[PDB]
Design an enzyme around this catalytic site. Structure first.
Site, mmCIF file in Angstrom:
data_model
loop_
_atom_site.group_PDB
_atom_site.id
_atom_site.type_symbol
_atom_site.label_atom_id
_atom_site.label_comp_id
_atom_site.label_asym_id
_atom_site.label_seq_id
_atom_site.Cartn_x
_atom_site.Cartn_y
_atom_site.Cartn_z
ATOM 1 N N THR H 30 0.865 -1.211 0.000
ATOM 2 C CA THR H 30 0.000 0.000 0.000
ATOM 3 C C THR H 30 0.890 1.246 0.000
ATOM 4 O O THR H 30 2.075 1.123 0.366
ATOM 5 C CB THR H 30 -0.968 0.018 1.192
ATOM 6 N N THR H 31 0.337 2.395 -0.393
ATOM 7 C CA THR H 31 1.073 3.683 -0.500
ATOM 8 C C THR H 31 1.276 4.269 0.901
ATOM 9 O O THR H 31 0.313 4.258 1.691
ATOM 10 C CB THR H 31 0.348 4.688 -1.406
#
Ligand SMILES: [Cl-]
Ligand SMILES: [Mg+2]
Ligand SMILES: [Mg+2]
Ligand SMILES: [Mg+2]
Ligand SMILES: [Mg+2]
Lengths: 244, 204, 4, 195, 221, 250, 241, 243, 231, 195, 4
Positions: H30-31
């Site tokens: 995930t970012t």
């Protein structure tokens, strides 16, 4: 991890042989021939130096024959560097026994312990075995004059006459032919040299390509003397038997 | 319970003209009780002689230990150890046990086979080397031996004369010590002959 | 130990 | 007799020069002021061997600190001293005063008694001879003194400590820690005795 | 009695030659002047074996260090190694040393105590005769001594110990370590305690000693 | 984590060869030529200083190393492997001999200790053999002058004269013709320079050649006086100037 | 072919892992240069900050090992910092044990011996870095000593490292052929830095702004790195001549 | 070949393929972002809501080291936790010996040397996380990003995970448009926006925003989580910008 | 393929296959369900037998008076991890006189599982766990995966055909979350949830295993005739 | 424990060992055999600290018996004594040393000679014609000095031994409840039942 | 030790 690069030195073949022991013996079969002959009144150790160079210092050299104590010597066949590791261990083991019991170590006890060390390298530790075969020539007050051999497997056996290294097949046949039980040292000296002279891969057997040693009771009254032959002494014994 | 004075005993070494002498008593006791009149305190490894006084178990142990070490030395060096070298080996070996030492007073004696020079040395139990031209003393009658040697000794004595001087130094020192005596041995050492003489002394 |  | 005093421009360390083995003075010109860093010095009291071994380890720790994280604070230096003194309290006899000059924190003084406790103070006194000048130092110490006032305060203080303490004497060494740099001062008996 | 004195272009150390066991003189001419490196010498007092053993160990490690760094060894290296060793053993190694020598940095003079404390000085004395020696040094020492003046002061400080201290006696050993020159070891620099001719020769008539047995000892193989 | 390589990296092949030792010897073959000649009154060891760059200061890199005051060493093969062996060889001379006997080891025994270290790299877990052959020249009171070769296997041989590395085969042939049992040290230095010129290609002067002798004692190199028995080191490294002097009368 | 994965000999007596570590050296695509003055040793290295989001002050391949010793690295920053931290610990321990500042050439040898161990011991990989150590040694004077993954080290009159090392090397070789001496005959370190940058500009053929370079200077009793403005002042001096 | 099968093995290129393979695990994650501001740092992360059954606000991914350092990471979450556990031990031993809390650059090298150590041996696996971390020390604010290789630099803005290129582009604009500097409260709002914009590269599952910050003025130099009114204010700001 | 020999090796796409193969052992394991309200947390586990002559493998383990889990996969690995939790729960009690937070329990399991995925020689844990507990912040349900990933949830299910129960709970979320101060109704919802993962077999008396913890309820397990109420 | 004697005569070694085992003010046993057979032609008597004596004797016995099986050969009395001495020499510098004194009586079959070895707990070995441990020596040694001859028979040796036991029974403070006598010769080890 |  590191499993990828493990040779697994201490495993069985499908046929029930130890790969590394077999290959170490193959290594030893190329090493300069060493002969041990046991007589009633002494023992002979003869060994052929590996293809000598003319500029090699011969007199201050030790390759084949080593002293373990005053009563025991060994003839080496294989990696000299490996043999010297085992020799220094054997020399210490002899002094440990003398320190403990105030008696010179019986030949077989020294041979067994050195053979037990080699055995260890074939069963555990994952290290390569010692690429060395010994001829043990020694005396004690139990069995008198004794010849043994040990090999990388850690198996040892007693002998009247034996060869290790190169051309053992040919050498053992010639010894088996001319050897008899009532033999003297001076006769055994002649047999040892005659055998090397015929099994040698060299053109002619000379003083500069030999190491020689006798273990006689030829000292003064009921005591053993170790004689590591000098170059000039090998030259004389080679002329005296009529090889040169 | 003073380890150096349970068993008792003495060693003395002297230098002469192209010779050395080393002598020891033969007593081994348990304090007041005399036990053995055959306990020699001088040993040799080739031509190098070592006398050891003090706790008898450590005398025996060190003899066995130096025999062990000089045997390996000879096998590797392919020659007999010299007195100067052996002295250093004794010092090393003793100091290795600095905080649990052998309760001994060793004395090295011998002639260097190369130079022909007479050599003697003494050590404390912890390995401090005491080199001397004239004489070395060790044991429960060291004070007595110091007094005898300092007065009787003169330089460049012939072997036959040196024998008398060392013998009288040991005997008269031993007779003023309760834990020393009960027989004596003297080694006269020349370049390539060694004579060993047992002395007649009072057996009390 | 002996002991300047 | 050792002391460190903070003042307007930074901090000054002072000490006597006497080293005793019983009643015998083994060294009468001892330097008891030791540099653990450019502008962090310490005053050593107690076992010469213990305080020496500690100071050497601290100097090593702060040299390695400087290589990685740049100039350490005086508080950091005192923490390293404490950590050694506290964790080895059973085997050490060391009373150390740590004094240093930051540009942010200016002059600071940390005293580390036998226990290995840390005490940050305006000024600190320690050693056998300090007992005789608790009264004097408490009555005469002021905050934000000048350099000359602080030098006189230390000189008079150690002068009395030396006079009464047989374990103290010789010369009065002082080390001045300011933004200007490091200044070594010495004062001989003929001067301080007749104060 | 051991002393160290700094001068113009280097440093000199000196010692007596007496070894004792209780009140008895064990050695009348022992050498307490030890070589750590060619131009770094050590004077040792305290437990005789400890001063010899610790000097040889650091001397060995200094030689290996000198070979490793391709540099002449420094006195501060020998000082640091000795004091860290002695400190580790909390004084149980009874070595009291005066360390002196010349190196690329200059000429140096230090003292080390058994517990691992080090001092710096122009003139130092250690041992049982240190107070007799230091009395002489405090009386006659000055700044800017010459070589010949420093040897005289050093040997005078040792003589004070020899005569006045029962722990010190016999001869004076000196070692001079000057900058740019080889260190000169002066074994028995002074011998002011030569034994007078004895009144009588105690050479016995031959056969005086009663003998029970004679035998030839076999030293050969 | 931790060294999981507790097993031999050098093992016997079906033919009985120890691959890594053979390959190590191959690395020695690639290495620059070094030689040793024994005279009646001394020993000479010599090698070419192969400079990595002309900006590099070849004086800072020493191929010929002092092990003891009376023993010197030179090599052919991998320089780094040689450097760590010299460190270990110097230390073992102290720990296993001088700290025991209070004197420096004889040549044959120090050689024996170096051989042991190189043999262990052949059998111990998770290590390759050393990629060097050493020539160790030395003197001791009871053996006199001696010259030894040490191979990656840990095998050592005593030599009257020999060469190792790049042009060893040709160099050994050259030495056989010139060597006699009556050679003086100066005659052996002369032959050493002649032998080395054959293998060297570029510049041949005191700055590109490294040469040391085991000869007479050097009291001037001892660093102190006052002990008659201490007479100074027999190992001496010839200077750049001292080599050029002998290259004129070549 | 597992003789190319770990540090064991290939049939032709080579260590491929050591050779591949050498190629990791140029992974950063940065060129370094070191020269000696009379009183000083100057080291310069290219500074490339491609990402705009990077804090340019934190991007550095020059390290202050001790007060006297400086070290520039050619290779990835993880291995560079690994080597830097170890060198710092080694220099600190040396001072504590032996009572004097570790010399540049002794630290070089020590780090080289560590590098050698990785070429012999299997479990440890070589560091993919070339370490250039610089100081003004109190015995040997201005000093440049350089270490590589093979465990090789040597002293230098001057040196260069990186992809275009050879162009810089020959540029310096030709200068020392001409000047006939072992160093830059210059009084101030300022002009020795100007020499270093000038000869890098000639060899690489590129112009440099203040943010394109990184400069380390070793003088007696201290090694220090120059700020952007210290370099800008230096670039202005070159331009006006 | 086979050069990629074992960690710490150099390829003929001079590359450690096992580290590059670890980077792929990071890219998959995930970012997560970091924004350096006037007097501190702001951290934000994308939390994919896999299911309705996930308890909101109760799967916290941003971690605190000591009291003044914030750590966030993308990739193998457990590997990140292991690194922070080490970070906390390193920061604890620093404070124990040196008294002062660990400076950020000092702390960055402690992680850097530890991660680099996991590229030296074949007996260990490289870290499967890029870690964005920083805080406030005596020398002010510091933001760092640490990669599987052990490589780390200081950053004005940092981004890693599946939406790193989108987040980097948006970060580069803030650096250009605010040369004098960005405030702490602004950086929180911008952080929200950039996570929402970076969510376009992971838009199958809807997500949960999580922000933390250290600021000399706003949080008194300590690490705190953004919650309640300040969080909802940052979400609303981000919602307004996507439309 | 070439990158699944051990846990220390990454695949070219950045995968740990040994961890994924460990994850596969869970899918083979028998279904178990976890769900909670604000007052209580419930575990429902379908037990599996070797044959009709064999007993039914116990799925639920108690860790403390206020915490326990249900397992799916290698049971011995669950015994190792449950034993570790018991010790950590117990350490928190003896040293700090403090009941271990269910969140910390998760963090400790995560870190223990992780160390086995980064070191040579070792292997990943081959089991998934559902940890329920009641602590100072009310009722909790955790899902542990041997990758190290621990997740706090309202409800979930793991094992074979777990997707059926997980979909049901995703629909029922709003209903069962507000079953406060009613144990029997929360269990009924859990029993109805696990029923969505059944094929050919139905819930019998020695087949069904239920556990509950809550506000005024210690962690207690129901087996045999005690679960006959809920069939 | 207490009284152990040994007499080497022409053709045998005779060991006499007290039968009393006393603890406090009670004789617990009056038939105790304070000896172990190490090998067919080697016997070791022992005396010293309670427990240590038997624990040490049996440990030596086990080691000699192990050697005999391994080499299918009997160790010489000299070899056994040297082994025992080394074990005690190790012991004395241990954390808790063996406080055991021993006599080793053996017949060397190669030399056809009896041999008596006296070894104290320190590891102090001596070969003797006659030996004793503890206070026993202070009576027997002077008695044997007088009456002992080297060429005596086994019967003459037993009469000489009776003379020692009579003297000890007369002048020793403690009742040691007589002795067990054992003879070691060419034919091995046998016990005299009527003494 | 020596010991202000
Ligand atoms: Cl090193
Ligand atoms: Mg008497
Ligand atoms: Mg009497
Ligand atoms: Mg006073
Ligand atoms: Mg490697």
């Amino acid at each position: 991890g590191s499993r990828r690069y493990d040779s697994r030195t201490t495993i069985f073949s499908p046929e029930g042989r130890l790969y590394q022991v077999e290959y170490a013996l193959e290594s030893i079969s190329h090493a300069g021939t060493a002969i041990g002959i046991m007589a009633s009144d002494g023992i002979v150790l003869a060994a052929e130096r590996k293809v000598t160079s003319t500029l090699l210092e011969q007199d201050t050299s030790t390759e084949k024959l080593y002293k373990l104590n005053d009563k025991i010597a060994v003839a080496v066949a294989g990696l000299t560097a490996d043999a010297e590791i085992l020799i220094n261990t054997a020399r210490i083991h002899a002094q440990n026994y003398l320190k403990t019991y105030n008696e010179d170590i019986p030949v077989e006890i020294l041979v067994r312990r050195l053979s037990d060390i080699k055995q260890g390298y074939t069963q555990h530790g994952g290290l390569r075995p010692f690429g060395v075969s010994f001829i043990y020539a020694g005396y004690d007050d139990r069995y008198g004059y004794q010849l043994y051999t040990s090999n990388p497997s850690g198996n040892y056996t007693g002998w009247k006459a034996i060869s290790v290294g190169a051309n053992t097949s040919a050498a053992q046949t010639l010894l088996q032919m001319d050897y008899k039980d009532d033999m003297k040292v001076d006769d055994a000296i002649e047999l040892a040299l005659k055998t090397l002279s015929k099994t040698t891969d060299s053109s002619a057997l000379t003083y500069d390509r030999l190491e020689f040693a006798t273990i006689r009771k030829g000292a003064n009254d009921g005591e053993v003397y170790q004689k590591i032959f000098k170059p000039q002494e090998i030259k004389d014994i080679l002329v005296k038997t009529g090889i040169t | 319970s003073d380890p150096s004075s349970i068993n008792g005993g003495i060693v003395v070494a002297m230098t002469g003209k192209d010779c050395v002498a080393i002598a020891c008593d033969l007593r081994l006791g348990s304090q007041s009780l005399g036990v053995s009149n055959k306990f020699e305190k001088i040993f040799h490894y080739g031509h190098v002689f070592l006398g050891i006084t003090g706790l008898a178990t450590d005398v025996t142990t060190l003899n066995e230990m130096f025999r062990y070490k000089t045997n390996l030395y000879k096998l590797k060096e392919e020659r007999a150890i010299e007195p100067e070298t052996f002295t250093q080996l004794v010092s090393s070996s003793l100091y290795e046990r600095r905080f649990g030492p052998y309760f001994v007073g060793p004395v090295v004696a011998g002639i260097n086979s190369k130079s022909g020079k007479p050599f003697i040395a003494g050590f404390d139990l912890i390995g401090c080397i005491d080199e001397a031209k004239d004489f070395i003393v060790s044991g429960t009658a060291s004070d007595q031996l110091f007094g005898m040697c300092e007065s009787l000794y003169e330089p460049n004595l012939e072997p036959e004369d040196l024998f008398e001087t060392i013998s009288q130094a040991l005997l008269n020192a031993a007779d003023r010590d309760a834990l020393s005596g009960w027989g004596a041995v003297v080694y006269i050492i020349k370049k390539d002959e060694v004579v060993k003489r047992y002395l007649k002394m009072r057996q009390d | 130990x002996a002991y300047x | 007799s050792i002391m460190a005093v903070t003042f307007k421009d930074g901090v000054i360390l002072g000490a006597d020069s006497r080293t005793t083995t019983g009643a015998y003075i083994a060294n009468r010109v001892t330097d008891k002021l030791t540099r653990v860093h450019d502008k962090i010095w310490c005053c050593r009291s107690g076992s010469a061997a213990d305080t020496q071994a500690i100071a050497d380890i601290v100097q090593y720790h702060l040299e390695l600190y400087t290589s990685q994280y740049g100039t350490p604070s005086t508080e950091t230096a005192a923490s390293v001293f404490k950590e050694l003194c506290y964790e080895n309290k059973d085997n050490l006899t060391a009373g150390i005063i740590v004094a240093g000059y930051d540009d942010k924190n200016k002059g600071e003084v940390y005293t580390i008694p036998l226990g290995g406790s840390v005490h940050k103070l305006p000024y600190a006194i320690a050693g056998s001879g300090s007992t005789f000048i608790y009264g004097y130092c408490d009555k005469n110490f002021r905050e934000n003194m000048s350099k000359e006032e602080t030098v006189d305060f230390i000189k008079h203080s150690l002068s009395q400590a030396i006079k009464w303490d047989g374990s103290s004497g010789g010369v009065i060494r002082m080390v001045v820690l300011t933004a200007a740099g490091v200044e070594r001062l010495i004062f001989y008996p003929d001067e301080y005795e007749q104060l | 009695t051991i002393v160290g004195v700094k001068f113009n272009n280097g440093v000199v150390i000196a010692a007596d030659t007496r070894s004792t066991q209780g009140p008895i003189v064990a050695d009348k001419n022992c050498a307490k002047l030890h070589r750590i490196s060619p131009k770094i010498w050590c004077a040792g007092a305290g437990t005789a074996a400890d001063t010899e053993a610790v000097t040889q160990l650091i001397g060995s490690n200094i030689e290996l260090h000198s070979l490793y760094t391709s540099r002449e060894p420094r006195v501060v290296s020998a000082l640091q190694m000795l004091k860290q060793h002695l400190f580790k053993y909390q004084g149980h190694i009874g070595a009291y040393l005066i360390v002196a020598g010349v190196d690329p940095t200059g000429s140096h003079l230090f003292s080390i105590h058994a517990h691992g404390s080090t001092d710096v000085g122009y003139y130092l004395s250690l041992g049982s005769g240190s107070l007799a020696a230091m009395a002489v040094l405090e009386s006659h020492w000055k700044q800017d001594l010459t070589k010949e003046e420093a040897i005289k002061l050093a040997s005078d400080a040792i003589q004070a110990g020899i005569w006045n201290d029962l722990g010190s006696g016999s001869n004076v050993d000196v070692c001079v370590m000057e900058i740019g020159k080889d260190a000169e070891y002066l074994r028995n620099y002074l011998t002011p305690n030569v034994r007078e001719e004895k009144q009588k020769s105690y050479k016995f008539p031959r056969g005086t000693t009663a003998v029970l047995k004679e035998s030839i000892v076999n030293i050969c193989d | 984590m931790t060294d999981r390589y507790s097993f031999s990296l050098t093992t016997f092949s079906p033919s009985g060869k120890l691959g890594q030792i053979d390959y190590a010897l191959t690395a020695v073959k690639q290495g620059v030529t070094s030689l040793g000649i024994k005279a009646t009154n001394g020993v000479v060891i010599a090698t070419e200083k192969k400079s990595s760059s002309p900006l590099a200061m070849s004086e800072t890199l020493s191929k010929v190393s002092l092990l003891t005051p009376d023993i010197g060493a030179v090599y052919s093969g991998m320089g780094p492997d040689y450097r760590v062996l010299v460190d270990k060889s110097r230390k073992v001379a102290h720990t296993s001999y001088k700290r025991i006997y209070g004197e420096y080891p004889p040549t044959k025994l120090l050689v024996s200790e170096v051989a042991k270290i190189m043999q262990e790299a052949t059998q111990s877990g998770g290590v390759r053999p050393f990629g060097v052959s050493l020539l160790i020249a030395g003197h001791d009171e009871f053996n006199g002058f001696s010259l030894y070769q040490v191979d990656p296997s840990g095998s050592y041989f005593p030599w009257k004269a020999t060469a190792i590395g790049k042009g060893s085969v040709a160099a050994k042939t050259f030495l056989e013709k010139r060597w006699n049992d009556e050679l003086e040290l100066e005659d052996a230095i002369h032959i050493a320079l002649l032998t080395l010129k054959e293998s060297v290609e570029g510049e041949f002067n005191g700055d590109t050649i490294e040469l040391a002798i085991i000869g007479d004692e050097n009291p001037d190199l001892l660093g102190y006086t006052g002990i008659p028995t201490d007479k100074g080191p027999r190992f001496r490294k010839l200077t750049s100037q001292e080599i050029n002097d002998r290259l004129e009368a070549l | 072919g597992y003789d190319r994965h770990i540090t064991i000999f290939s049939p032709e007596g080579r260590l491929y892992q050591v050779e591949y570590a050498f190629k990791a050296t140029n992974q950063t695509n940065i060129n370094s240069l070191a020269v000696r003055g009379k009183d000083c040793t100057v080291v310069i290295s290219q500074k490339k900050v491609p990402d705009k989001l990077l804090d340019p002050t934190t991007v550095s391949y020059i390290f202050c090992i001790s007060r006297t010793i400086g070290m520039v690295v050619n290779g990835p920053i993880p291995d560079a910092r690994n080597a830097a931290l170890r060198a710092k610990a080694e220099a600190a321990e040396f001072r504590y044990k032996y009572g004097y500042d570790m010399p540049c050439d002794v630290l070089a040898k020590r780090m080289a011996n560590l590098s050698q161990i990785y070429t012999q011991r299997a479990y440890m990989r070589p560091l993919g870095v070339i370490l250039t150590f610089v100081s003004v040694d109190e015995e040997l004077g201005p000093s440049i000593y350089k270490t590589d993954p093979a465990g090789y080290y040597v002293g230098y009159k001057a040196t260069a490292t990186g992809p275009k090392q050879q162009e810089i090397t020959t540029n310096l070789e030709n200068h020392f052929k001409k000047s006939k001496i072992d160093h830059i005959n210059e009084e101030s370190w300022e002009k020795v830095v100007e020499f270093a940058i000038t000869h890098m500009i000639d060899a690489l053929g590129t112009e440099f702004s203040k943010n394109d370079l990184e400069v380390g200077v070793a003088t007696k009793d201290k090694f220090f790195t120059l700020s952007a403005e210290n370099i800008e002042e230096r670039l202005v001096a070159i331009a006006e001549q | 070949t086979g050069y990629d099968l074992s960690n710490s093995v150099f390829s003929p290129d001079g590359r450690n393929f096992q580290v590059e393979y670890a980077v792929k695990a990071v890219e998959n994650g995930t970012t997560s972002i970091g924004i350096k501001c006037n007097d501190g740092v702001v951290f934000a992360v994308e939390k994919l809501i896999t299911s309705k059954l996930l308890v909101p606000q109760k799967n916290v991914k941003i971690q605190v080291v000591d009291r003044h350092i914030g750590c966030v990471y993308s990739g193998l979450i457990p590997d990140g936790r292991h690194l922070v556990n080490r970070g906390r031990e390193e920061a604890a031993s620093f404070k124990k010996l040196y008294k002062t809390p660990i400076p950020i650059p000092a702390f960055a090298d402690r992680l850097g040397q530890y991660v680099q150590a996991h590229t030296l041996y074949n007996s260990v696996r490289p870290f499967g996380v890029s870690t964005i971390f920083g805080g406030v020390d005596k020398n002010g604010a510091h933001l760092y990003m640490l990669e599987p290789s052990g490589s780390y630099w200081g950053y004005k803005g940092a981004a890693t995970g599946k939406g790193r290129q989108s987040a980097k582009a948006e970060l580069e604009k803030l650096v250009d448009h605010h040369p004098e500097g960005l405030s702490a409260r602004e950086a929180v709002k911008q952080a929200a926006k950039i996570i929402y914009l970076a969510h376009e590269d992971n838009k199958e599952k809807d997500f949960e925003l999580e922000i933390s910050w250290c600021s000399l003025s706003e949080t008194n130099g300590l690490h705190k989580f953004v919650k309640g009114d300040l969080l909802q204010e940052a979400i609303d700001f981000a919602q307004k910008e996507i439309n | 393929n070439n990158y699944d020999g051990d846990t220390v090796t990454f695949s070219p796409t950045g995968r740990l296959f040994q961890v994924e193969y460990a994850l596969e052992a869970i899918k083979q394991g028998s279904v178990t369900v976890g769900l909670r309200s604000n007052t209580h947390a419930v575990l429902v586990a379908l037990k599996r037998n070797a044959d009709e002559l064999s007993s039914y493998q116990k799925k639920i383990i108690k860790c403390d008076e206020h915490m326990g889990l249900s397992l799916a996969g290698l049971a011995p690995d669950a015994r190792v991890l449950s034993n570790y939790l018991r010790q950590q729960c117990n350490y928190s009690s003896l040293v700090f006189n403090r009941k271990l937070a269910v969140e910390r329990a998760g963090h400790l399991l995560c870190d223990k599982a992780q160390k086995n995925t980064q070191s040579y020689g070792g292997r990943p844990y081959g089991v998934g766990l559902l940890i329920i507990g009641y602590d100072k912040s009310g009722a909790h349900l955790l899902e542990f995966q041997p990758s190290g990933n621990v997740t706090e949830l309202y409800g979930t299910a793991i094992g074979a055909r777990s997707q059926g129960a997980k979909t049901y709970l995703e629909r029922t979320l709003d209903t069962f979350i507000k079953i406060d101060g009613n144990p029997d109704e929360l269990i009924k919802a859990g029993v109805e949830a696990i029923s969505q993962s059944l094929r050919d077999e139905s819930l019998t008396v020695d087949n069904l295993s239920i556990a509950i913890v809550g506000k005024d309820t210690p962690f207690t397990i129901y087996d045999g005739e005690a679960v006959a109420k809920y069939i | 424990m207490d009284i152990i004697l040994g007499i080497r005569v022409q053709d045998s070694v005779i060991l006499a060992s007290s039968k009393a085992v006393t603890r406090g003010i009670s004789v617990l046993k009056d038939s105790d055999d304070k000896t172990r057979q190490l090998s067919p032609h080697t016997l070791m008597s022992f005396a010293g600290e309670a427990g240590d004596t038997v624990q040490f004797a049996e440990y030596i016995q086990a080691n000699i018996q192990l050697y005999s099986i391994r080499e299918d050969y009997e160790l010489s009395p000299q070899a056994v004594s040297s082994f025992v001495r080394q074990e005690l020499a190790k012991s004395i510098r241990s954390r808790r040393p063996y406080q055991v004194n021993v006599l080793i009586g053996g017949y060397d079959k190669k030399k056809n000679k009896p041999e008596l070895y006296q070894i104290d707990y320190l590891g102090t070995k001596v070969e003797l014609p006659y030996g004793a441990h503890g206070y026993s020596g202070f009576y027997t040694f002077s008695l044997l000095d007088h009456h002992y001859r080297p060429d005596m028979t086994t019967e003459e040796g037993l009469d000489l031994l009776k003379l020692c036991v009579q003297e000890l029974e007369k002048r020793m403070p403690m009742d040691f409840k007589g002795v067990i006598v054992k003879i070691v010769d060419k034919d091995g080890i046998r016990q005299v039942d009527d003494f």
